[PDB]
Amino acid sequence: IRMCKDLKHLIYYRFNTGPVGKGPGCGFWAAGWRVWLFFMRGITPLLERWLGNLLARQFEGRHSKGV
RNA sequence: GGUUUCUCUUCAGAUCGCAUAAAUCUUUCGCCUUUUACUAAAGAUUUCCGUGGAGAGGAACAAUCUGAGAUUUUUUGAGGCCUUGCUUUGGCAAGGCU
Numbered sequence A: 001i002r003m004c005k006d007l008k009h010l011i012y013y014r015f016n017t018g019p020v021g022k023g024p025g026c027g028f029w030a031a032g033w034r035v036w037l038f039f040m041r042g043i044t045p046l047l048e049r050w051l052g053n054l055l056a057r058q059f060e061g062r063h064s065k066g067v
Numbered sequence B: 001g002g003u004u005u006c007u008c009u010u011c012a013g014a015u016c017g018c019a020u021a022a023a024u025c026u027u028u029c030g031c032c033u034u035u036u037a038c039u040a041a042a043g044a045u046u047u048c049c050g051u052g053g054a055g056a057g058g059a060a061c062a063a064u065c066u067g068a069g070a071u072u073u074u075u076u077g078a079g080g081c082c083u084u085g086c087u088u089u090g091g092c093a094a095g096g097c098u
């Protein structure tokens, strides 16, 4: 989130330079899109393992003593 | 001595990736009632998103294509001839010849 905020500042202070002002008209979404896809690369196996454990506890049942 | 595409197997020691996430363990910090979820540095490992080389099989298209392959100076007649020793009998070593 912090990286995205920093990127926005960078983009805005390369955008609002000449006659353009502080309007909401700047949409240059490639950098934040890159950041959230690299996050999604990292968060795919962790969420896969977590939801697999959730489904296995939902269907196989919870081991009482177990480990 | 074809291209394109799909799948499988094997090897990566190249910035395998002119990009970059996450997790585990051991310690140091910070926040701090306690536990997750946390802070950010190191080390040891992993997973994931991708990649390169080689081989094999399949499918669709061009059906070949791409190759490798002489006289006029200095590289051709200034060529033949008797004698002495050896003849090693194809001639060698020495003289005036043309």
Ligand SMILES: O=P(O)(O)O[C@H]1[C@@H](OP(=O)(O)O)[C@@H](OP(=O)(O)O)[C@@H](OP(=O)(O)O)[C@@H](OP(=O)(O)O)[C@H]1OP(=O)(O)O
Binding pocket: A005, A012, A022, A023, A024
């Ligand atoms: O720095 P942030 O906290 O991330 O807020 C910014 C900032 O607004 P603030 O100055 O008030 O903090 C920008 O403003 P500028 O200084 O660059 O002019 C910009 O606002 P502008 O559109 O007017 O440039 C942008 O706004 P937005 O993302 O809507 O485009 C956004 O403000 P927000 O946090 O409200 O979104």
